[PDB]
Amino acid sequence: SITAPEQGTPVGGVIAEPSAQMSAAADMATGKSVDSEWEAFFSFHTSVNWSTSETQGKILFKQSLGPLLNPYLEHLAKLYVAWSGSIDVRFSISGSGVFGGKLAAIVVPPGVDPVQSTSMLQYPHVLFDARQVEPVIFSIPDLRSTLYHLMSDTDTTSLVIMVYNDLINPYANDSNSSGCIVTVETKPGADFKFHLLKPPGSMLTHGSVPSDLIPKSSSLWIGNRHWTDITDFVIRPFVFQANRHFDFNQETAGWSTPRYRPITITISEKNGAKLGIGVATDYIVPGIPDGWPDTTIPEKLTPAGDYAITNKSGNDITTAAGYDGADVIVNNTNFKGMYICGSLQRAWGDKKISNTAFITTATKVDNAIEPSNVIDMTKIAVYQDTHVGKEVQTSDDTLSLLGYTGIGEQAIGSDRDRVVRISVLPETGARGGNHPIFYKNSIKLGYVIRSIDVFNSQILHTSRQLSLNHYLLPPDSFAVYRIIDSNGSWFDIGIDSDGFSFVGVSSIGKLEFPLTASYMGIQLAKIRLASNI
Amino acid sequence: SITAPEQGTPVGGVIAEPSAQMSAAADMATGKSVDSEWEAFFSFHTSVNWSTSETQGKILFKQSLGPLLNPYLEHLAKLYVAWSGSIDVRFSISGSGVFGGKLAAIVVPPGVDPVQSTSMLQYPHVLFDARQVEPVIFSIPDLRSTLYHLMSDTDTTSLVIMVYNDLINPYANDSNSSGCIVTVETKPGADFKFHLLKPPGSMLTHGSVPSDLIPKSSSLWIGNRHWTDITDFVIRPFVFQANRHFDFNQETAGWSTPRYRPITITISEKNGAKLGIGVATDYIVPGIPDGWPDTTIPEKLTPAGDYAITNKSGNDITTAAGYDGADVIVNNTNFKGMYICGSLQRAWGDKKISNTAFITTATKVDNAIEPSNVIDMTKIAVYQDTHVGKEVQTSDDTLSLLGYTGIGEQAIGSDRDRVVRISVLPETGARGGNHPIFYKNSIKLGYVIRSIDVFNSQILHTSRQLSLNHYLLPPDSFAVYRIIDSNGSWFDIGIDSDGFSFVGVSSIGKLEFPLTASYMGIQLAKIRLASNIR
Amino acid sequence: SITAPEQGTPVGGVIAEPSAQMSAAADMATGKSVDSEWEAFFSFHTSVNWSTSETQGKILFKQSLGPLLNPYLEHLAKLYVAWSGSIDVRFSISGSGVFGGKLAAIVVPPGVDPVQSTSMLQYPHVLFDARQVEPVIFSIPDLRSTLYHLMSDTDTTSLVIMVYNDLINPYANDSNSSGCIVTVETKPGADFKFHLLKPPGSMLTHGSVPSDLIPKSSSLWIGNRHWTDITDFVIRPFVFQANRHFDFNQETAGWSTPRYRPITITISEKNGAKLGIGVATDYIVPGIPDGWPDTTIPEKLTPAGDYAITNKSGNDITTAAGYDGADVIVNNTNFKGMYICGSLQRAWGDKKISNTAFITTATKVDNAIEPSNVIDMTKIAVYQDTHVGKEVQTSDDTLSLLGYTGIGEQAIGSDRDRVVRISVLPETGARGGNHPIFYKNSIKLGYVIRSIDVFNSQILHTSRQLSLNHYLLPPDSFAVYRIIDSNGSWFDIGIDSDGFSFVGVSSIGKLEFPLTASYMGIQLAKIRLASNIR
Ligand SMILES: [K+]
Ligand SMILES: [K+]
Ligand SMILES: [K+]
């Protein structure tokens, strides 16, 4: 009655029985290494740049030992919870002959964090000159106080590439944009082996490694507030968002899933209102629809009319494309910062076509509406003519968001008292000299064909992965990535335990926008994030 | 000069000496054949029902290795810092013979946390049928990266029993459901050894497992907002409290200790002034008294008069048929959301008997009080008529929470805007798909002979233990406690690193309250807290 | 068909199996060379000072055999019903070399109780000088009429150290006193064995030793009459209390449980009546509420007015200089000996805010109350102005003891004629030459910013344990607890079968209160409870 995992009554394959002569035939037909071909060669892992800007003692690379240093181990790591052993490395520089400089590789032991000083070269290190063609090979040993590791462990032996002598080029003393791509390739050491099969589907108690929060291409980057594509970055002393922002505990202080979909509600008004209060039909928090905008109007306003724009204290309408070359707008509209949403006003006996929506969160005192810094089921304002008479009308609406009304304003997310929360707004300032960032994209206005900027605290892929998956990161640390544009400009972003992405520079500048991202590793939040801009 | 721990000249007994005939006689009288008997038998651990309603891939049993499995090791563990080795976990099942259905066993390694899914069976598993006669043992090996375990350690090898094939009765209809319960027992195992005997009176430098947070019986459960006994659980999307709510870091965003005792203050009303500001006399935070209640008033109002309520149309209520017969209450009373607080009210020269008080955090402008939910040295309001006439008095006063004047309002702790904090309000939402819970008490009302509900973030025993004892729990896990009522309907509560409690179902319903609570283990927060409601 | 307690088919771990290389590795990492380490070393028990002031025939050390000597046996003893065998009690002394003085050791048999007298040396005794270098062991043999001992057993072989020759310093003058302290350690002994492992959740049918009656620290001491913390002891020739005073038979001549919580009652005053009789709502004895205070008024009087006191000559007191400056007080107040009791005071139609109460056991004749110290269903007095007009009201009321209006009176519990009973007042006098003691609290007063002393027969932890747990103690013995203050001045309290406490000296004096209490053992009541006051 008891059966073991390798136990049963063997009947065979009725028509035939497995032949060894055919399995030996297939080995010679294909060649053969011993059951793991990936243990026999070096595989491309990453490449890093080294310009003339990087002075002596700077660190271009730090990645800790682990199975993420080789793609074939990152694949088979998914079938296990523990590992142990060394990784072999081969690195080279695609330099020129006219280039000098020299570069060093330092396997620092566990525990230590390095410092950008030439004192780290008072320790065994592999010199590599830019003029050197043949690559160089060396091992990264597993020096561990334990007997095995876990996939989340990042206190392992680590490698750093450090500038030993500055790179030189007598030519470009005007552009200073020289090259020397520095590739790193990896092979498993013979002492490498995985331990402890995990059951499939089972989660890891100590979590996984945050190596998939940002995609590897900017074509996939979209905002957590508006669905458009990211176009550039913004650095500010404070960065805050609640709606689709998720921390590493799968917790959001907002009210919406990491999706963009229509918003279904149910208005109910009478006597001629045009300014009703909806109620949720699809939600995660009771009262607020899933996907309701996280921004409030500037002031108290009584929506009754139509658009109205004018320039610097001039009473001159921007009827034409002379909108540009104005630099200040009054925006005299009675609807002055709402969100435009196409509606399907379904009702019994309306017998008239639907109308646009002009939604926001606010307190309905009367026909007017007051800015509500906080959201609630008693704050969900909608300004559209549902064609109401004296008797009640309980239409179904099913909005979808298209644009914005606040012409001539700052980017959505600059002002804080207009940005919506439930109770507590997440917020982060500078954390060890590193500055937080927004992700900037655009949203269409309602009157002028131009668009307005929008600030985002995350990329939606970063929110979807933090809503679903379980990662490890200590609070005093980042999950650091490296952004590289089509040119040789790069900078490291750092995503904290709260979900906010930081940057070490004060200004990124413009960048050729087909970008890529690679996971470097876990860093402390104190040490400034590397850059070359 | 030097003497070892076993060294000294023996003289013995002076009138007699120890005998072996008498020690042998005690082994005759007893059945003493070997010491450490718990190593020689299996001891009860628990028992699970396996019904036909339970589809495949469901987990029935799940325990991690450790000395909390067997009670005889849980006892000796108090003397040692460390342990190591394997436990043997016997399983017994008594099927009907005509039944069918196989049941799997998986010893998942350390570092994982199982899930209810057949993917767990894509892994080595032993099976045993309902027609299994003899018990099966399933030694759990100690797989460890360290050389010994501590007692605070919980990432250990675990064993799960889960339904491989559904249980089958050929006679039973599709409607009626049957079952066979599976019993679980444990024994220390041969390689099990404790390590590093500790001296008594020794702080253990990491604590122990969170096994003593919820008492094992409901008679000992009282809230952290009001002192009365719990009566039911309340699931809400957001849960929040500051005063007596403590986390695993022994730190609090509140102002009071986990104990209910009177509130001594002093108040120095000057002129004819039935209200004034009181100053702390006993405190852990400067300015705020210890035991001061964490709820404000709804509105700005002047306490001057008597009680008043109406049945939605001005019909005043003066009888139980009106109060219970009402659907809602207006409560036009002028001292609405406060606490009665008997108030001894001593002073020098105040020969008049004392008068009850009404307290909240609120500002004061010369007659009134406004709702201010940020407590300070100046947000300590009192209204008790300390017989003042045109002269500073400086009375001393001691106050004991009795009731709550806010008739008709919702349950206390249901509105953050009215709940009091210093700077930061601890608050949670649904971690995983597990909903938070308040613990429900009731508190007395003013002149009505009914009561009003009261919500609580913790049980006071949970707060008390987290103020004194040090525990490890990462911010991704829960300390799980299986609740079992009198009928056998059960569910698992999971306590947070933040101190809040959770439950893995949208509604618990009603249930017998002479109920219990047993620590099952540490559990990751994503995984839905198990339950069986009926 | 049948399966023994160690029987079942083993399959083991399915992914791995137990290893010995890893269990060996934990013994390498640790110092594990043998299990049950407490059998291999001597553990600290206590230490005594031997000074030159101490004449011959004085007893310094006295312990009976048992597992409460060593803490590692006191722990395992919780798993077993019985024990047997000998303990080894090491002694260490470090004299100056120039000292002289011999010290005796006597293992007195079971059935006796020693005395401080040289007649004890007319018996086999071993001696050891101040110049003793190495420790001495002195195994205590288990002489027993039974075949095994239980844990409740205390008539066991004992060992006493006593001064055979006074300690001598040739340099020290007759005035100055020196000393050498003797340290005592214990080890389980070779023939020691526990017996009859008990299943958990098992009542032990005789209990255990009275080792947990007084807590080990003074921060946890509160009286059985008022909830406040103790501050000093009070020796009186007679001691008496009924309400929360419990004996070792789990029986009481009182009416309340050992816990302080509010007092819910109902009162049905008819006409304009500021006083009436309340009826129990929560009770263990029919008629009397649980928590009702056990003290009467001094005199017949009508509660109608305000407070009033005078300084022996009509000079009213309205300031601290007058109260403290006074020698005695008249207290012409009309509501003298009662308790303030905040009184929520709800009812249907009583919109007026509540008013404090004044309670005692007393009769009532239409305006007044007379002191009746026999509590009944009709001796439940209240004076709180429940806004009654010419109509029965039947208010519900909850009351919480705050203070005591009897300004100027002596300490509460000092007059039997005022202390309340049902039928029988428990009472003791001087057993042996050991004087009883009250435990002293203080209770708040009415409008004075001072307090008044309060006497207590027990600590509430002592009452609580004697209500729930079953203990053996004959009516001739005491359960002894050695009190030690911060300076080292000590004395022994002995608790009675009746529940009362005693002390072996006429006056204790003043002493540091961060003090402790340790159980020394059972002691016959004739023998004077030892002490060392300084
Ligand atoms: K329509
Ligand atoms: K007074
Ligand atoms: K009342």
PDB file of N, CA and C in Angstrom, chain A residues 1-5 81 146-148 150 196-206 249-251 254 285-286 422-424 468-470, chain B residues 108-115 119-120 122-123 125-129 132 136 143-145 155 238 416 427 429-431 475-476 524 526:
ATOM      1  N   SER A   1       0.812  -1.211   0.000  1.00  0.00           N
ATOM      2  CA  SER A   1       0.000   0.000   0.000  1.00  0.00           C
ATOM      3  C   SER A   1       0.851   1.269   0.000  1.00  0.00           C
ATOM      4  N   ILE A   2       2.099   1.154   0.449  1.00  0.00           N
ATOM      5  CA  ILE A   2       3.059   2.250   0.375  1.00  0.00           C
ATOM      6  C   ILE A   2       3.850   2.097  -0.909  1.00  0.00           C
ATOM      7  N   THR A   3       3.995   3.191  -1.645  1.00  0.00           N
ATOM      8  CA  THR A   3       4.840   3.240  -2.823  1.00  0.00           C
ATOM      9  C   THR A   3       5.765   4.443  -2.735  1.00  0.00           C
ATOM     10  N   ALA A   4       7.007   4.226  -3.123  1.00  0.00           N
ATOM     11  CA  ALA A   4       8.080   5.194  -3.085  1.00  0.00           C
ATOM     12  C   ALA A   4       8.215   5.879  -4.436  1.00  0.00           C
ATOM     13  N   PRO A   5       8.993   6.966  -4.520  1.00  0.00           N
ATOM     14  CA  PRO A   5       8.989   7.781  -5.744  1.00  0.00           C
ATOM     15  C   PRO A   5       9.548   7.091  -6.975  1.00  0.00           C
ATOM     16  N   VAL A  81      16.979  25.567  -4.505  1.00  0.00           N
ATOM     17  CA  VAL A  81      16.988  26.626  -3.503  1.00  0.00           C
ATOM     18  C   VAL A  81      18.377  26.928  -2.954  1.00  0.00           C
ATOM     19  N   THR A 146      29.185  29.356   5.838  1.00  0.00           N
ATOM     20  CA  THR A 146      28.153  28.352   5.862  1.00  0.00           C
ATOM     21  C   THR A 146      28.615  27.144   5.063  1.00  0.00           C
ATOM     22  N   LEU A 147      27.711  26.189   4.881  1.00  0.00           N
ATOM     23  CA  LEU A 147      27.971  24.990   4.108  1.00  0.00           C
ATOM     24  C   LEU A 147      27.245  24.984   2.783  1.00  0.00           C
ATOM     25  N   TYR A 148      26.218  25.808   2.639  1.00  0.00           N
ATOM     26  CA  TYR A 148      25.637  26.090   1.344  1.00  0.00           C
ATOM     27  C   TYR A 148      25.098  27.508   1.371  1.00  0.00           C
ATOM     28  N   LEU A 150      21.976  30.233  -0.344  1.00  0.00           N
ATOM     29  CA  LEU A 150      20.626  30.321  -0.856  1.00  0.00           C
ATOM     30  C   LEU A 150      20.642  31.310  -2.006  1.00  0.00           C
ATOM     31  N   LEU A 196      19.459  20.970  -3.106  1.00  0.00           N
ATOM     32  CA  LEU A 196      18.107  21.183  -2.597  1.00  0.00           C
ATOM     33  C   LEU A 196      17.135  21.621  -3.697  1.00  0.00           C
ATOM     34  N   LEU A 197      16.749  20.654  -4.530  1.00  0.00           N
ATOM     35  CA  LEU A 197      15.539  20.796  -5.333  1.00  0.00           C
ATOM     36  C   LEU A 197      14.426  21.439  -4.528  1.00  0.00           C
ATOM     37  N   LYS A 198      13.782  22.431  -5.129  1.00  0.00           N
ATOM     38  CA  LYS A 198      12.555  22.979  -4.586  1.00  0.00           C
ATOM     39  C   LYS A 198      11.367  22.350  -5.305  1.00  0.00           C
ATOM     40  N   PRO A 199      10.246  22.091  -4.639  1.00  0.00           N
ATOM     41  CA  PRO A 199       9.050  21.711  -5.367  1.00  0.00           C
ATOM     42  C   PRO A 199       8.621  22.832  -6.295  1.00  0.00           C
ATOM     43  N   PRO A 200       8.220  22.535  -7.532  1.00  0.00           N
ATOM     44  CA  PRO A 200       7.752  23.610  -8.409  1.00  0.00           C
ATOM     45  C   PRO A 200       6.514  24.291  -7.855  1.00  0.00           C
ATOM     46  N   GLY A 201       6.454  25.606  -8.045  1.00  0.00           N
ATOM     47  CA  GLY A 201       5.397  26.425  -7.511  1.00  0.00           C
ATOM     48  C   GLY A 201       5.636  26.903  -6.097  1.00  0.00           C
ATOM     49  N   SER A 202       6.437  26.175  -5.334  1.00  0.00           N
ATOM     50  CA  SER A 202       6.735  26.557  -3.968  1.00  0.00           C
ATOM     51  C   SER A 202       7.551  27.838  -3.947  1.00  0.00           C
ATOM     52  N   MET A 203       7.265  28.685  -2.969  1.00  0.00           N
ATOM     53  CA  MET A 203       7.966  29.942  -2.798  1.00  0.00           C
ATOM     54  C   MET A 203       9.163  29.765  -1.881  1.00  0.00           C
ATOM     55  N   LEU A 204      10.109  30.689  -2.006  1.00  0.00           N
ATOM     56  CA  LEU A 204      11.300  30.703  -1.175  1.00  0.00           C
ATOM     57  C   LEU A 204      11.055  31.609   0.021  1.00  0.00           C
ATOM     58  N   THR A 205      11.436  31.143   1.210  1.00  0.00           N
ATOM     59  CA  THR A 205      11.191  31.929   2.412  1.00  0.00           C
ATOM     60  C   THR A 205      12.029  33.194   2.419  1.00  0.00           C
ATOM     61  N   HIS A 206      13.291  33.085   2.030  1.00  0.00           N
ATOM     62  CA  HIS A 206      14.182  34.224   1.971  1.00  0.00           C
ATOM     63  C   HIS A 206      14.065  34.985   0.665  1.00  0.00           C
ATOM     64  N   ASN A 249       6.994  44.398  -0.155  1.00  0.00           N
ATOM     65  CA  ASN A 249       6.090  43.545   0.602  1.00  0.00           C
ATOM     66  C   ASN A 249       4.754  43.344  -0.104  1.00  0.00           C
ATOM     67  N   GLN A 250       4.690  43.622  -1.407  1.00  0.00           N
ATOM     68  CA  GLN A 250       3.466  43.471  -2.189  1.00  0.00           C
ATOM     69  C   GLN A 250       2.345  44.344  -1.644  1.00  0.00           C
ATOM     70  N   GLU A 251       2.716  45.512  -1.136  1.00  0.00           N
ATOM     71  CA  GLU A 251       1.801  46.431  -0.480  1.00  0.00           C
ATOM     72  C   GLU A 251       1.820  47.765  -1.199  1.00  0.00           C
ATOM     73  N   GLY A 254      -2.255  52.724  -2.269  1.00  0.00           N
ATOM     74  CA  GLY A 254      -3.298  53.217  -3.136  1.00  0.00           C
ATOM     75  C   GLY A 254      -4.467  52.272  -3.270  1.00  0.00           C
ATOM     76  N   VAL A 285     -10.240  48.324  -3.174  1.00  0.00           N
ATOM     77  CA  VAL A 285     -10.587  48.978  -1.918  1.00  0.00           C
ATOM     78  C   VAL A 285     -12.062  49.357  -1.999  1.00  0.00           C
ATOM     79  N   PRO A 286     -12.874  49.086  -0.973  1.00  0.00           N
ATOM     80  CA  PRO A 286     -14.296  49.441  -1.071  1.00  0.00           C
ATOM     81  C   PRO A 286     -14.498  50.940  -1.199  1.00  0.00           C
ATOM     82  N   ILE A 422      -4.753  57.785   0.336  1.00  0.00           N
ATOM     83  CA  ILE A 422      -5.872  57.298   1.131  1.00  0.00           C
ATOM     84  C   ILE A 422      -5.730  57.855   2.540  1.00  0.00           C
ATOM     85  N   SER A 423      -4.666  57.466   3.241  1.00  0.00           N
ATOM     86  CA  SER A 423      -4.213  58.184   4.428  1.00  0.00           C
ATOM     87  C   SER A 423      -2.784  58.672   4.299  1.00  0.00           C
ATOM     88  N   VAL A 424      -1.853  57.777   3.986  1.00  0.00           N
ATOM     89  CA  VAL A 424      -0.425  58.050   4.069  1.00  0.00           C
ATOM     90  C   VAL A 424       0.147  58.023   2.661  1.00  0.00           C
ATOM     91  N   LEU A 468       3.187  40.869  -7.492  1.00  0.00           N
ATOM     92  CA  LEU A 468       3.021  39.433  -7.621  1.00  0.00           C
ATOM     93  C   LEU A 468       4.151  38.659  -6.963  1.00  0.00           C
ATOM     94  N   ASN A 469       5.388  39.010  -7.283  1.00  0.00           N
ATOM     95  CA  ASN A 469       6.539  38.214  -6.908  1.00  0.00           C
ATOM     96  C   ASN A 469       7.102  38.661  -5.571  1.00  0.00           C
ATOM     97  N   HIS A 470       7.921  37.788  -4.992  1.00  0.00           N
ATOM     98  CA  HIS A 470       8.442  37.950  -3.643  1.00  0.00           C
ATOM     99  C   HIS A 470       9.954  38.035  -3.712  1.00  0.00           C
TER     100      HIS A 470
ATOM    101  N   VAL B 108       9.680  18.641   2.220  1.00  0.00           N
ATOM    102  CA  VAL B 108      10.225  19.734   1.427  1.00  0.00           C
ATOM    103  C   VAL B 108      11.449  20.269   2.157  1.00  0.00           C
ATOM    104  N   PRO B 109      12.420  20.846   1.464  1.00  0.00           N
ATOM    105  CA  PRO B 109      13.661  21.189   2.112  1.00  0.00           C
ATOM    106  C   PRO B 109      13.515  22.477   2.896  1.00  0.00           C
ATOM    107  N   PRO B 110      14.588  22.955   3.508  1.00  0.00           N
ATOM    108  CA  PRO B 110      14.567  24.295   4.081  1.00  0.00           C
ATOM    109  C   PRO B 110      14.752  25.354   3.015  1.00  0.00           C
ATOM    110  N   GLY B 111      14.248  26.544   3.320  1.00  0.00           N
ATOM    111  CA  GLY B 111      14.264  27.648   2.394  1.00  0.00           C
ATOM    112  C   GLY B 111      13.007  27.812   1.579  1.00  0.00           C
ATOM    113  N   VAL B 112      12.129  26.813   1.561  1.00  0.00           N
ATOM    114  CA  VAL B 112      10.882  26.874   0.816  1.00  0.00           C
ATOM    115  C   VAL B 112       9.708  27.051   1.770  1.00  0.00           C
ATOM    116  N   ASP B 113       8.550  27.347   1.191  1.00  0.00           N
ATOM    117  CA  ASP B 113       7.293  27.407   1.913  1.00  0.00           C
ATOM    118  C   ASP B 113       6.231  26.816   0.987  1.00  0.00           C
ATOM    119  N   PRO B 114       5.581  25.702   1.338  1.00  0.00           N
ATOM    120  CA  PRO B 114       4.733  25.008   0.364  1.00  0.00           C
ATOM    121  C   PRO B 114       3.537  25.825  -0.092  1.00  0.00           C
ATOM    122  N   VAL B 115       2.867  25.277  -1.107  1.00  0.00           N
ATOM    123  CA  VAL B 115       1.651  25.841  -1.675  1.00  0.00           C
ATOM    124  C   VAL B 115       0.696  24.686  -1.943  1.00  0.00           C
ATOM    125  N   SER B 119       1.718  20.885  -8.341  1.00  0.00           N
ATOM    126  CA  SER B 119       3.119  21.086  -8.674  1.00  0.00           C
ATOM    127  C   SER B 119       4.036  20.592  -7.565  1.00  0.00           C
ATOM    128  N   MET B 120       3.550  20.569  -6.327  1.00  0.00           N
ATOM    129  CA  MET B 120       4.320  20.018  -5.225  1.00  0.00           C
ATOM    130  C   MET B 120       4.554  18.527  -5.383  1.00  0.00           C
ATOM    131  N   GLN B 122       5.364  17.193  -8.239  1.00  0.00           N
ATOM    132  CA  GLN B 122       6.397  17.065  -9.252  1.00  0.00           C
ATOM    133  C   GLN B 122       7.745  17.050  -8.554  1.00  0.00           C
ATOM    134  N   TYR B 123       7.884  16.154  -7.596  1.00  0.00           N
ATOM    135  CA  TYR B 123       8.900  16.201  -6.564  1.00  0.00           C
ATOM    136  C   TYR B 123       8.803  14.856  -5.853  1.00  0.00           C
ATOM    137  N   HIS B 125       7.769  12.044  -3.558  1.00  0.00           N
ATOM    138  CA  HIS B 125       6.657  11.904  -2.640  1.00  0.00           C
ATOM    139  C   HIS B 125       6.360  10.432  -2.411  1.00  0.00           C
ATOM    140  N   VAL B 126       6.119  10.095  -1.157  1.00  0.00           N
ATOM    141  CA  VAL B 126       5.667   8.776  -0.746  1.00  0.00           C
ATOM    142  C   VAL B 126       4.157   8.831  -0.612  1.00  0.00           C
ATOM    143  N   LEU B 127       3.503   7.724  -0.940  1.00  0.00           N
ATOM    144  CA  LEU B 127       2.057   7.625  -0.913  1.00  0.00           C
ATOM    145  C   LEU B 127       1.641   6.534   0.057  1.00  0.00           C
ATOM    146  N   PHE B 128       0.422   6.658   0.570  1.00  0.00           N
ATOM    147  CA  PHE B 128      -0.156   5.624   1.407  1.00  0.00           C
ATOM    148  C   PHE B 128      -1.669   5.717   1.332  1.00  0.00           C
ATOM    149  N   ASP B 129      -2.305   4.564   1.186  1.00  0.00           N
ATOM    150  CA  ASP B 129      -3.715   4.483   0.865  1.00  0.00           C
ATOM    151  C   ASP B 129      -4.557   4.560   2.134  1.00  0.00           C
ATOM    152  N   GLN B 132      -4.291   1.691   4.423  1.00  0.00           N
ATOM    153  CA  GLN B 132      -3.047   1.469   5.140  1.00  0.00           C
ATOM    154  C   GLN B 132      -3.353   0.997   6.552  1.00  0.00           C
ATOM    155  N   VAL B 136       3.038   4.887   9.597  1.00  0.00           N
ATOM    156  CA  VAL B 136       4.247   5.218   8.860  1.00  0.00           C
ATOM    157  C   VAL B 136       4.955   6.335   9.608  1.00  0.00           C
ATOM    158  N   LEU B 143      18.484  19.228   7.687  1.00  0.00           N
ATOM    159  CA  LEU B 143      19.325  19.808   6.661  1.00  0.00           C
ATOM    160  C   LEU B 143      19.561  21.254   7.059  1.00  0.00           C
ATOM    161  N   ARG B 144      20.823  21.604   7.273  1.00  0.00           N
ATOM    162  CA  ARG B 144      21.176  22.872   7.879  1.00  0.00           C
ATOM    163  C   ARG B 144      22.488  23.345   7.289  1.00  0.00           C
ATOM    164  N   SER B 145      22.552  24.636   6.985  1.00  0.00           N
ATOM    165  CA  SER B 145      23.798  25.233   6.531  1.00  0.00           C
ATOM    166  C   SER B 145      24.748  25.497   7.684  1.00  0.00           C
ATOM    167  N   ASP B 155      13.783  28.267   9.808  1.00  0.00           N
ATOM    168  CA  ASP B 155      14.026  27.773   8.456  1.00  0.00           C
ATOM    169  C   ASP B 155      14.653  26.389   8.563  1.00  0.00           C
ATOM    170  N   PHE B 238      -8.690  47.849   6.181  1.00  0.00           N
ATOM    171  CA  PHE B 238      -7.601  48.574   6.808  1.00  0.00           C
ATOM    172  C   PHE B 238      -7.781  48.526   8.312  1.00  0.00           C
ATOM    173  N   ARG B 416     -10.209  56.609  11.025  1.00  0.00           N
ATOM    174  CA  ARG B 416      -8.856  57.086  11.285  1.00  0.00           C
ATOM    175  C   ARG B 416      -8.844  58.559  11.652  1.00  0.00           C
ATOM    176  N   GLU B 427      -0.572  51.105  10.305  1.00  0.00           N
ATOM    177  CA  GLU B 427      -1.711  50.729   9.491  1.00  0.00           C
ATOM    178  C   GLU B 427      -1.276  49.687   8.477  1.00  0.00           C
ATOM    179  N   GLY B 429      -2.950  46.853   5.205  1.00  0.00           N
ATOM    180  CA  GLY B 429      -4.013  46.410   4.336  1.00  0.00           C
ATOM    181  C   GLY B 429      -3.938  44.914   4.158  1.00  0.00           C
ATOM    182  N   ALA B 430      -4.428  44.421   3.031  1.00  0.00           N
ATOM    183  CA  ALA B 430      -4.453  42.989   2.773  1.00  0.00           C
ATOM    184  C   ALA B 430      -3.081  42.552   2.288  1.00  0.00           C
ATOM    185  N   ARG B 431      -2.335  41.882   3.156  1.00  0.00           N
ATOM    186  CA  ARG B 431      -1.094  41.245   2.757  1.00  0.00           C
ATOM    187  C   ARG B 431      -1.409  39.885   2.160  1.00  0.00           C
ATOM    188  N   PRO B 475       9.777  40.945   7.783  1.00  0.00           N
ATOM    189  CA  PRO B 475       8.540  41.635   7.402  1.00  0.00           C
ATOM    190  C   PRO B 475       7.729  40.931   6.331  1.00  0.00           C
ATOM    191  N   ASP B 476       8.117  39.730   5.900  1.00  0.00           N
ATOM    192  CA  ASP B 476       7.388  38.979   4.889  1.00  0.00           C
ATOM    193  C   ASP B 476       6.621  37.784   5.437  1.00  0.00           C
ATOM    194  N   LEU B 524       4.906  32.355   5.490  1.00  0.00           N
ATOM    195  CA  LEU B 524       5.039  33.491   4.601  1.00  0.00           C
ATOM    196  C   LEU B 524       3.674  34.126   4.374  1.00  0.00           C
ATOM    197  N   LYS B 526       2.274  35.754   1.720  1.00  0.00           N
ATOM    198  CA  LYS B 526       1.533  35.548   0.481  1.00  0.00           C
ATOM    199  C   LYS B 526       0.533  34.416   0.623  1.00  0.00           C
TER     200      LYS B 526
END
